CSV table of C-alpha atoms in Angstrom, one decimal:
chain,number,residue,atom,x,y,z
A,1,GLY,CA,-21.5,3.8,12.6
A,2,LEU,CA,-23.3,4.6,15.8
A,3,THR,CA,-25.8,3.0,18.2
A,4,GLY,CA,-27.2,4.1,21.6
A,5,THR,CA,-30.2,5.6,23.4
A,6,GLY,CA,-31.1,9.2,23.7
A,7,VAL,CA,-33.1,12.3,23.4
A,8,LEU,CA,-32.9,14.1,20.0
A,9,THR,CA,-33.2,17.8,19.2
A,10,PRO,CA,-31.7,19.9,16.3
A,11,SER,CA,-28.1,21.2,16.4
A,12,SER,CA,-26.7,24.7,16.7
A,13,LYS,CA,-23.4,24.1,14.9
A,14,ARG,CA,-21.0,25.7,12.5
A,15,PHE,CA,-21.0,22.2,11.1
A,16,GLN,CA,-18.5,21.0,8.6
A,17,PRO,CA,-19.0,19.2,5.3
A,18,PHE,CA,-16.7,16.3,6.1
A,19,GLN,CA,-18.1,16.1,9.5
A,20,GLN,CA,-20.5,14.0,11.6
A,21,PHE,CA,-19.7,14.0,15.4
A,22,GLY,CA,-19.4,16.3,18.4
A,23,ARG,CA,-17.9,14.5,21.5
A,24,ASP,CA,-18.6,17.6,23.4
A,25,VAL,CA,-16.9,17.3,26.9
A,26,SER,CA,-15.0,14.2,25.8
A,27,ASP,CA,-15.7,11.3,23.4
A,28,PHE,CA,-19.5,11.0,23.8
A,29,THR,CA,-20.7,12.2,20.4
A,30,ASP,CA,-23.3,14.7,21.8
A,31,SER,CA,-24.4,16.0,18.3
A,32,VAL,CA,-24.9,14.2,15.0
A,33,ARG,CA,-25.5,15.0,11.4
A,34,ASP,CA,-28.3,12.9,10.1
A,35,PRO,CA,-27.5,11.1,6.8
A,36,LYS,CA,-30.4,12.9,5.1
A,37,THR,CA,-29.2,16.5,5.9
A,38,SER,CA,-30.3,17.3,9.4
A,39,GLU,CA,-28.2,18.8,12.2
A,40,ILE,CA,-29.3,17.2,15.5
A,41,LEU,CA,-27.9,17.3,19.0
A,42,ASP,CA,-28.1,13.9,20.8
A,43,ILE,CA,-28.6,14.6,24.5
A,44,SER,CA,-28.5,10.9,25.4
A,45,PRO,CA,-29.3,11.4,29.2
A,46,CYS,CA,-32.9,10.4,28.8
A,47,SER,CA,-33.4,10.9,32.5
A,48,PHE,CA,-31.7,9.3,35.5
B,1,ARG,CA,12.4,11.6,-23.7
B,2,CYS,CA,14.3,13.7,-21.2
B,3,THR,CA,13.4,17.0,-22.7
B,4,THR,CA,15.5,18.7,-20.0
B,5,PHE,CA,16.3,22.4,-19.7
B,6,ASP,CA,19.9,23.5,-18.9
B,7,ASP,CA,19.5,27.0,-17.3
B,8,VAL,CA,18.3,25.5,-14.0
B,9,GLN,CA,20.5,27.3,-11.4
B,10,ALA,CA,21.6,26.0,-8.1
B,11,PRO,CA,20.5,28.2,-5.2
B,12,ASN,CA,22.1,28.3,-1.8
B,13,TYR,CA,19.0,26.5,-0.3
B,14,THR,CA,17.6,29.6,1.3
B,15,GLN,CA,16.6,29.2,4.9
B,16,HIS,CA,13.5,30.5,6.7
B,17,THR,CA,11.4,29.9,9.7
B,18,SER,CA,8.5,27.4,10.0
B,19,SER,CA,6.9,29.5,12.7
B,20,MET,CA,3.2,28.6,12.9
B,21,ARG,CA,2.3,26.7,9.8
B,22,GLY,CA,1.1,23.1,9.3
B,23,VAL,CA,-1.9,22.9,11.7
B,24,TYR,CA,-4.8,20.9,10.4
B,25,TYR,CA,-7.8,19.1,11.6
B,26,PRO,CA,-6.5,15.8,13.2
B,27,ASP,CA,-10.0,14.4,13.6
B,28,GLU,CA,-13.2,14.5,11.5
B,29,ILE,CA,-15.2,15.6,14.4
B,30,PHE,CA,-16.6,18.8,15.9
B,31,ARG,CA,-15.5,19.9,19.4
B,32,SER,CA,-15.6,23.1,21.3
B,33,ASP,CA,-13.8,24.9,24.1
B,34,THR,CA,-11.0,22.3,24.7
B,35,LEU,CA,-7.3,21.8,24.7
B,36,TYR,CA,-7.1,18.6,22.6
B,37,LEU,CA,-3.9,16.6,22.6
B,38,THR,CA,-2.6,14.3,19.9
B,39,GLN,CA,0.6,12.7,18.8
B,40,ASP,CA,1.5,12.9,15.1
B,41,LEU,CA,4.0,13.8,12.4
B,42,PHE,CA,3.6,17.5,12.4
B,43,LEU,CA,5.8,20.4,11.3
B,44,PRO,CA,7.4,21.8,14.5
B,45,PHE,CA,7.0,25.4,15.4
B,46,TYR,CA,9.7,27.8,14.4
B,47,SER,CA,11.8,25.2,12.6
B,48,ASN,CA,13.8,25.4,9.3
B,49,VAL,CA,12.2,26.1,5.9
B,50,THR,CA,14.3,25.2,2.9
B,51,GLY,CA,12.8,27.8,0.7
B,52,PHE,CA,13.4,27.8,-3.0
B,53,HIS,CA,13.4,31.2,-4.7
B,54,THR,CA,13.1,30.4,-8.3
B,55,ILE,CA,13.5,33.8,-10.1
B,56,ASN,CA,14.1,35.1,-13.7
B,57,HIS,CA,17.6,33.6,-13.6
B,58,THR,CA,17.4,30.9,-10.8
B,59,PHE,CA,15.1,28.0,-11.6
B,60,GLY,CA,14.2,25.5,-8.8
B,61,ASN,CA,13.2,22.0,-10.1
B,62,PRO,CA,15.3,19.5,-8.1
B,63,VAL,CA,14.4,15.9,-7.1
B,64,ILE,CA,13.8,15.4,-3.4
B,65,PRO,CA,13.0,12.2,-1.5
B,66,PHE,CA,9.8,11.8,0.5
B,67,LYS,CA,11.1,11.9,4.2
B,68,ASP,CA,8.0,11.8,6.3
B,69,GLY,CA,6.0,14.0,3.9
B,70,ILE,CA,6.3,17.7,3.7
B,71,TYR,CA,4.7,20.9,4.7
B,72,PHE,CA,4.4,22.5,1.4
B,73,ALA,CA,3.7,26.1,0.5
B,74,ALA,CA,3.9,28.1,-2.8
B,75,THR,CA,3.2,31.7,-3.6
B,76,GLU,CA,1.7,31.6,-7.0
B,77,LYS,CA,-0.3,34.2,-8.9
B,78,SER,CA,-2.6,32.1,-11.0
B,79,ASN,CA,-1.0,28.8,-10.3
B,80,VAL,CA,2.4,27.9,-11.7
B,81,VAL,CA,3.1,25.0,-9.4
B,82,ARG,CA,0.6,22.4,-10.4
B,83,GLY,CA,2.1,18.9,-10.4
B,84,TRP,CA,4.0,16.6,-8.0
B,85,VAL,CA,6.1,13.7,-9.1
B,86,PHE,CA,5.7,11.4,-6.1
B,87,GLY,CA,7.8,8.6,-7.5
B,88,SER,CA,9.9,5.6,-6.5
B,89,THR,CA,13.1,5.5,-8.7
B,90,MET,CA,12.7,8.4,-11.2
B,91,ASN,CA,13.2,6.3,-14.3
B,92,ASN,CA,11.0,4.1,-16.5
B,93,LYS,CA,10.8,1.6,-13.6
B,94,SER,CA,9.3,3.9,-11.0
B,95,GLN,CA,6.3,3.4,-8.8
B,96,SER,CA,5.2,6.9,-9.5
B,97,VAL,CA,2.0,8.9,-8.9
B,98,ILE,CA,1.8,12.2,-10.6
B,99,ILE,CA,-0.5,15.0,-9.4
B,100,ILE,CA,-1.3,17.3,-12.4
B,101,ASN,CA,-4.2,19.1,-14.0
B,102,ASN,CA,-5.9,19.5,-17.3
B,103,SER,CA,-6.2,23.2,-16.2
B,104,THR,CA,-9.8,22.7,-15.2
B,105,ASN,CA,-9.8,19.3,-13.4
B,106,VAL,CA,-7.4,17.5,-11.2
B,107,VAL,CA,-5.8,14.4,-12.9
B,108,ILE,CA,-3.8,12.2,-10.5
B,109,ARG,CA,-2.3,9.0,-11.8
B,110,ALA,CA,-0.1,6.2,-10.5
B,111,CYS,CA,1.7,3.8,-12.7
B,112,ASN,CA,5.1,2.6,-13.6
B,113,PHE,CA,5.8,5.6,-15.8
B,114,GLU,CA,8.8,6.8,-17.8
B,115,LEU,CA,10.2,9.6,-15.7
B,116,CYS,CA,12.1,12.0,-17.9
B,117,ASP,CA,14.8,14.0,-16.3
B,118,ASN,CA,12.8,17.2,-16.8
B,119,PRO,CA,9.4,17.1,-18.6
B,120,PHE,CA,8.0,20.6,-18.7
B,121,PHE,CA,4.8,22.5,-19.4
B,122,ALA,CA,5.7,24.8,-22.4
B,123,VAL,CA,3.5,27.5,-20.9
B,124,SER,CA,3.5,30.9,-22.6
B,125,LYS,CA,3.2,34.1,-20.6
B,126,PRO,CA,-0.1,35.7,-21.9
B,127,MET,CA,-2.0,32.5,-22.4
B,128,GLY,CA,-0.9,29.5,-20.3
B,129,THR,CA,-1.1,26.4,-22.5
B,130,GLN,CA,0.3,23.0,-21.6
B,131,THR,CA,1.4,22.5,-25.2
B,132,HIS,CA,4.1,20.1,-24.2
B,133,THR,CA,2.3,18.1,-21.4
B,134,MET,CA,4.3,15.0,-22.5
B,135,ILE,CA,4.5,13.5,-19.1
B,136,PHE,CA,2.3,10.4,-19.9
B,137,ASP,CA,5.1,8.6,-21.6
B,138,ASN,CA,4.9,4.9,-20.7
B,139,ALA,CA,2.3,2.5,-19.4
B,140,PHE,CA,3.4,-0.9,-18.3
B,141,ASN,CA,2.4,-2.6,-15.1
B,142,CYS,CA,-0.1,0.2,-14.3
B,143,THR,CA,-2.0,0.8,-11.2
B,144,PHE,CA,-4.3,3.7,-10.6
B,145,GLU,CA,-6.0,6.8,-11.9
B,146,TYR,CA,-8.2,9.5,-10.2
B,147,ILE,CA,-10.0,12.5,-11.4
B,148,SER,CA,-11.2,15.1,-8.8
B,149,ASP,CA,-13.3,18.2,-8.8
B,150,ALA,CA,-13.2,20.3,-11.9
B,151,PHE,CA,-12.8,23.8,-10.5
B,152,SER,CA,-11.6,27.3,-11.3
B,153,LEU,CA,-7.9,27.1,-12.3
B,154,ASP,CA,-5.6,29.4,-14.3
B,155,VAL,CA,-2.1,29.0,-15.7
B,156,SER,CA,-0.6,32.3,-17.0
B,157,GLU,CA,1.9,34.7,-15.4
B,158,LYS,CA,0.9,37.5,-13.1
B,159,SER,CA,2.5,39.5,-10.2
B,160,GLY,CA,1.5,41.9,-7.5
B,161,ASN,CA,0.7,40.5,-4.1
B,162,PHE,CA,1.4,36.8,-3.5
B,163,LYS,CA,-2.1,36.4,-4.7
B,164,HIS,CA,-2.5,32.6,-4.4
B,165,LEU,CA,-0.9,31.0,-1.4
B,166,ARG,CA,-1.0,27.3,-1.6
B,167,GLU,CA,-0.5,25.9,2.0
B,168,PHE,CA,-0.4,22.2,1.5
B,169,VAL,CA,0.4,19.2,3.7
B,170,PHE,CA,1.5,16.0,1.9
B,171,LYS,CA,1.5,13.1,4.4
B,172,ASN,CA,1.9,9.4,3.8
B,173,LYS,CA,-0.2,7.3,6.2
B,174,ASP,CA,-0.6,3.5,6.4
B,175,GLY,CA,-0.3,3.3,2.6
B,176,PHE,CA,-2.7,6.2,2.0
B,177,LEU,CA,-1.8,9.8,1.0
B,178,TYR,CA,-3.4,12.6,3.0
B,179,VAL,CA,-3.4,15.9,1.3
B,180,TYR,CA,-4.8,19.1,2.8
B,181,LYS,CA,-5.7,22.5,1.3
B,182,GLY,CA,-5.6,26.0,2.6
B,183,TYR,CA,-5.7,29.5,1.0
B,184,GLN,CA,-4.5,32.9,2.1
B,185,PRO,CA,-4.0,36.4,0.7
B,186,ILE,CA,-0.5,37.3,1.5
B,187,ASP,CA,1.9,40.1,0.4
B,188,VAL,CA,5.6,39.7,1.1
B,189,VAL,CA,8.3,40.6,-1.3
B,190,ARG,CA,9.6,37.0,-1.8
B,191,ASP,CA,9.5,35.3,1.7
B,192,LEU,CA,7.1,33.8,4.2
B,193,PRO,CA,4.8,36.0,6.3
B,194,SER,CA,4.2,35.4,10.0
B,195,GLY,CA,0.8,33.8,10.6
B,196,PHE,CA,-1.2,30.6,10.8
B,197,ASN,CA,-3.9,29.1,8.6
B,198,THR,CA,-5.9,26.0,9.5
B,199,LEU,CA,-5.6,23.3,6.8
B,200,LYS,CA,-8.5,21.4,5.7
B,201,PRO,CA,-9.0,17.6,5.5
B,202,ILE,CA,-9.5,17.5,1.8
B,203,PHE,CA,-7.9,14.6,0.0
B,204,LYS,CA,-7.5,11.1,1.2
B,205,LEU,CA,-6.3,8.5,-1.2
B,206,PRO,CA,-6.4,4.7,-1.5
B,207,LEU,CA,-3.0,4.5,-3.3
B,208,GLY,CA,-0.7,2.2,-1.4
B,209,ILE,CA,2.7,2.3,-3.1
B,210,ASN,CA,6.3,2.9,-1.8
B,211,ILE,CA,6.7,6.6,-2.4
B,212,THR,CA,10.4,7.4,-2.2
B,213,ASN,CA,11.4,10.4,-4.4
B,214,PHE,CA,9.6,13.5,-5.5
B,215,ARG,CA,9.9,16.4,-7.9
B,216,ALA,CA,8.0,19.6,-8.1
B,217,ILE,CA,6.4,20.8,-11.3
B,218,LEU,CA,6.4,24.4,-12.5
B,219,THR,CA,5.4,26.0,-15.8
B,220,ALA,CA,8.4,26.7,-18.1
B,221,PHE,CA,7.5,29.8,-20.0
B,222,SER,CA,8.2,28.9,-23.6
B,223,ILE,CA,13.5,28.1,-22.8
B,224,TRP,CA,11.9,28.4,-19.4
B,225,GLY,CA,10.5,31.4,-17.5
B,226,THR,CA,9.3,32.2,-14.0
B,227,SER,CA,7.6,35.0,-12.2
B,228,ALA,CA,8.4,36.8,-8.9
B,229,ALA,CA,7.5,33.8,-6.8
B,230,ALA,CA,8.8,31.3,-4.3
B,231,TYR,CA,8.0,27.9,-2.8
B,232,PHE,CA,9.0,26.3,0.4
B,233,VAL,CA,10.0,22.8,1.8
B,234,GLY,CA,9.4,21.7,5.4
B,235,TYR,CA,9.9,18.4,7.0
B,236,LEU,CA,7.6,16.8,9.6
B,237,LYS,CA,8.5,15.4,13.0
B,238,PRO,CA,6.6,12.9,15.2
B,239,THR,CA,5.7,15.4,17.9
B,240,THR,CA,2.8,16.2,20.2
B,241,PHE,CA,0.4,19.1,19.9
B,242,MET,CA,-2.2,20.7,22.2
B,243,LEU,CA,-4.8,22.4,20.0
B,244,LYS,CA,-7.4,25.0,21.2
B,245,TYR,CA,-10.7,24.6,19.5
B,246,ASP,CA,-13.3,27.4,19.8
B,247,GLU,CA,-17.0,27.4,19.8
B,248,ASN,CA,-17.0,28.1,16.1
B,249,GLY,CA,-15.0,24.9,15.5
B,250,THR,CA,-12.0,26.7,14.2
B,251,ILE,CA,-8.4,26.2,15.3
B,252,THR,CA,-7.3,29.4,17.0
B,253,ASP,CA,-4.1,28.3,18.7
B,254,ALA,CA,-1.7,25.3,18.6
B,255,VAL,CA,1.1,24.4,21.1
B,256,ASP,CA,3.8,21.9,20.4
B,257,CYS,CA,5.3,19.8,23.2
B,258,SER,CA,8.9,19.1,22.0
B,259,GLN,CA,9.8,22.7,21.3
B,260,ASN,CA,10.1,24.7,24.5
B,261,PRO,CA,10.0,23.8,28.2
B,262,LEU,CA,7.3,26.4,28.3
B,263,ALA,CA,5.7,24.8,25.3
B,264,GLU,CA,5.7,21.3,26.9
B,265,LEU,CA,4.5,22.8,30.1
B,266,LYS,CA,1.6,24.3,28.2
B,267,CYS,CA,0.8,20.9,26.8
B,268,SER,CA,1.4,19.4,30.3
C,1,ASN,CA,0.8,-24.1,-13.0
C,2,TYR,CA,4.0,-22.1,-13.1
C,3,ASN,CA,2.1,-19.0,-14.3
C,4,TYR,CA,1.8,-17.1,-10.9
C,5,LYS,CA,4.7,-16.2,-8.7
C,6,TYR,CA,6.0,-14.5,-5.6
C,7,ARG,CA,9.0,-12.5,-4.5
C,8,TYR,CA,11.5,-13.6,-1.9
C,9,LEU,CA,14.5,-11.2,-2.0
C,10,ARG,CA,14.5,-7.6,-0.6
C,11,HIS,CA,16.2,-5.2,1.7
C,12,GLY,CA,14.0,-5.9,4.7
C,13,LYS,CA,10.5,-5.2,6.1
C,14,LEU,CA,7.6,-3.0,5.0
C,15,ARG,CA,5.0,-0.5,6.2
C,16,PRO,CA,1.3,-1.6,5.8
C,17,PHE,CA,-0.5,-1.6,2.5
C,18,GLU,CA,2.3,-0.9,0.1
C,19,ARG,CA,3.5,-2.5,-3.1
C,20,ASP,CA,6.3,-2.5,-5.6
C,21,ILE,CA,5.9,-4.2,-9.0
C,22,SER,CA,9.6,-3.6,-9.6
C,23,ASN,CA,11.5,-6.8,-10.6
C,24,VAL,CA,14.7,-5.7,-8.9
C,25,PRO,CA,17.7,-7.9,-9.9
C,26,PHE,CA,18.8,-7.9,-6.3
C,27,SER,CA,22.3,-7.5,-4.8
C,28,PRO,CA,22.7,-7.0,-1.1
C,29,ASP,CA,24.1,-3.4,-1.3
C,30,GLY,CA,22.1,-2.0,-4.2
C,31,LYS,CA,24.3,-2.8,-7.3
C,32,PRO,CA,21.8,-3.4,-10.2
C,33,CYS,CA,22.9,-6.7,-11.6
C,34,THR,CA,22.2,-8.8,-14.5
C,35,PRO,CA,21.8,-12.4,-13.3
C,36,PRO,CA,23.5,-14.9,-13.4
C,37,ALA,CA,26.0,-12.7,-11.5
C,38,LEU,CA,27.2,-13.4,-8.0
C,39,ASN,CA,24.6,-12.5,-5.3
C,40,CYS,CA,22.6,-11.3,-8.3
C,41,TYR,CA,19.3,-13.1,-8.8
C,42,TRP,CA,15.7,-12.3,-9.6
C,43,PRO,CA,13.0,-12.5,-7.0
C,44,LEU,CA,10.5,-14.4,-9.3
C,45,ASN,CA,9.3,-17.7,-7.9
C,46,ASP,CA,6.6,-19.9,-9.3
C,47,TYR,CA,3.8,-21.6,-7.3
C,48,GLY,CA,4.2,-25.3,-8.2
């Protein structure tokens, strides 16, 4: 249910079973659970 | 077949404090190191608790209407209080969902059921059998069934500490029913301890019927019988909370707005 | 085709996604009637 453009790396969570998203500072998702069991941070600022 | 017991005493509707209970996860999303605001039907801090102390003489099985859901809590030692009669009219005609167990697995079922005036589990003290689980009376204009996780679940009578603490939240929402689960080891004589426990977003349900009335379901030790136990009632209020998530993703503190000028200043 | 129906008598509005099968023999202050009593009808109405 997500789209976008970014730089991927694995997560560092205490991630939850019902859970997918991270929105870290506010509402910007910043960490995703892959649908095939991976925990991956999404640092979308590619470079700018 | 209203197989209704008679020694069901009227208590004085014992009153307690709703200090810090009812906090759950409003989102489905990790965050960290925030104060998050949201506006929702929550149990306020410090408010009333209509606690029901069913004892060896006093039995507490009333009918209560829905009224913005409930904060629910029950101190059972191997699980007396399975079952909720979330009904409409408490007769044969009722849009009723029933939340019960086959002692291993969770059986929830909504249909127009015959609601007896007191159907009871004829549960014995050393074993714990639903010998008289006669609740499935009628089936006309039926709607829905659901069977959840089969998991570890006991029946029979114990004592000691309030070994199982069921902290539940039952919340109607846009037709759905949202039901949460907690667990806590507590030891009070008969009453509520002081403490908070974050409730988990467990059960969300596609039901969609006008849920008016409810009853609670206990185990009548077959003539009834109860242990040294109690269960609580709390009502929700459309208030505003500021939560404090940690880096672990665990609720460590909650602050209401409509409680104290200091509390609203905290959420301000 | 008078087989399928609708209902047109109730105490008021509704919340979303919510349903009652209950054929209530309506009276405007509760009062469970048997039609043909006064202000006591049934809500069933065919499709024509």
